[model samples]
Target chain A: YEVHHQKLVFFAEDVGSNKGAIIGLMVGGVV
Target chain B: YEVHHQKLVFFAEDVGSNKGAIIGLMVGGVV
Candidate 1:
């Protein structure tokens, strides 16, 4: 008996690192 | 107290428009 391979992929990109970092910091501080 | 209409109004000042503007912009961009 043979089994077929299954795969899953998730694609994403991070833009504007400085902007994201600051926003993350603010969110952390608020919560 | 005599019969009268009692109401409380709460007003807040926005410190920095830049802050909220940037936040709204980011949220809009994401969704």
Candidate 2:
């Protein structure tokens, strides 16, 4: 779960889009 | 919240990347 959360942070940092960060949490939730 | 959830689906469909989809949920969570 935390790993997925980190992916969101990574995307937000790299992609710099809220869209990417949002899905990260959902994926984490699902995983 | 649901709107943000939809964005992940949109990115997953358009971006076609698990990375994009995952990030979407994170952003949704933050929003």
Candidate 3:
């Protein structure tokens, strides 16, 4: 994202299952 | 991940098949 300017978007759309299987949501932002 | 208005956070949790099963990253985005 843009951080200080705004929109410090870092998203790792989550899904951890099985070994590291279906995890879920990893959203950090400033939009 | 929050979706809409700074979040449309959606995911498919990567799913495919062949290599045994649950193959590759079906891919994910929208966060």
Candidate 4:
């Protein structure tokens, strides 16, 4: 039986996404 | 007995003193 393979792929459009997310989360509760 | 009615005092500090104080207070509150 041949099963259709489902693959998960993630493409990061911006390389700064990680850094931006970190900064955002860090200052989330700040004024 | 020695009695002191009142006295005036003053101090000179850096321009960043306010910013430093606010930051310190903020960090203190966070902790």
lDDT of 3 by residue, B1-31 (tens): 2333333443354353222234334434444
TM-score of chain A of 1: 0.28
List the candidate 3 regions with Cα displacement exceeding 4 Å: A1-4, A14-31, B1-31
- Arranged by TM-score with the best first, the candidates are 1, 3, 4, 2
How many clashing residue pairs appear in each of the predictions shown?
0, 21, 15, 0
Against the true structure, whose DockQ is highest?
2
Q: Per candidate, chain B TM-score? A: 0.27, 0.13, 0.20, 0.22
lDDT of 4 by residue, B1-31 (tens): 5865766555554622234222211222321
Worst 10 residues of 1 chain B by lDDT: B22-31
| Structural similarity of chain A in candidate 4, as TM-score | 0.22
C-alpha lDDT of all candidate models, in order: 0.33, 0.30, 0.37, 0.37
Off by over 4 Å in 4: A1-4, A15-31, B1-31
lDDT of 2 by residue, A1-31 (tens): 2222212211322233334434323333321
Across A1-31, the per-residue lDDT of candidate 3 in tens digits comes to 3332223444442234344344334434433
Locate the minimum summed-lDDT window of 10 residues in model 4 chain B: B22-31
Task: Give interface RMSD, per candidate.
Answer: 28.0, 25.7, 22.9, 17.1
Cα RMSDs, all models: 28.0, 25.7, 22.9, 19.1
- What DockQ number belongs to candidate 2? 0.09
TM-scores, one per candidate: 0.21, 0.13, 0.18, 0.18
Between prediction 1 and prediction 4, which has the larger TM-score? 1
TM-score of model 3 (CA atoms):
0.18
Candidate 1 per-residue lDDT over residues B4-29, each given as its tens digit: 34344444443322332233223222
- Compose the digit string of candidate 2's lDDT tens values, residues B1-31: 2222212211323233334344333422331
